[PDB]
Design a protein around this nucleic acid. Structure first.
Ligand code: K
Ligand code: K
Ligand code: K
Ligand code: MG
Ligand code: MG
Length: 136
RNA sequence: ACAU
DNA sequence: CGATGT
């Protein structure tokens, strides 16, 4: 319907899928970059989108902020709601880092509480999410 | 089919 | 064109 401008927007960026994964969070109103994750050598788009939301939850909780989070990823929103990232990515030596970070994010969700609304960014109506990397 |  | 996901 209407954009909630008082919000945090998150997005993944990648080089290949699977490939090098990063993510960032921005103030929806102003575009100010609030956090950026150092690139992870091998991961998937959906793992990165999941980590971005969970990082947003942790960022907002530490700052006592009740703002919602926007994500464009139907998959990642569902994984966060379930507290379980149902990724198909093989677990091997090459993917150990991303899977460690995903496991740690699930662990955080299972030991902490939050009321943050996690909202779908409506790309078909509103254009690209404000945290997008501009690579498509 | 839809969402990345 | 290829991939990740519900
Ligand atoms: K998009
Ligand atoms: K992009
Ligand atoms: K498909
Ligand atoms: Mg996205
Ligand atoms: Mg994007």
């Amino acid at each position: 319907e209407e954009i909630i401008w008082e919000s945090l927007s998150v997005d993944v960026g990648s080089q290949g899928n699977p490939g090098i994964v990063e993510y960032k969070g921005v103030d929806t109103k102003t575009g100010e970059v609030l956090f950026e994750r150092e690139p992870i050598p091998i991961g998937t788009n959906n793992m990165g989108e999941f980590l971005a939301i969970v990082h947003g939850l942790r960022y907002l909780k530490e700052r006592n902020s009740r703002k919602p989070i926007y994500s464009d990823s139907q998959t990642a929103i569902k994984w966060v709601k379930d507290k379980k990232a149902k990724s198909t990515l093989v677990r091997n030596e090459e993917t150990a880092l991303i899977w460690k970070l995903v496991d740690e994010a699930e662990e955080w969700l299972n030991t902490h509480t939050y009321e943050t609304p996690i909202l779908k960014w409506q790309t078909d109506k509103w254009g690209e999410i404000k945290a997008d990397y501009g690579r498509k």
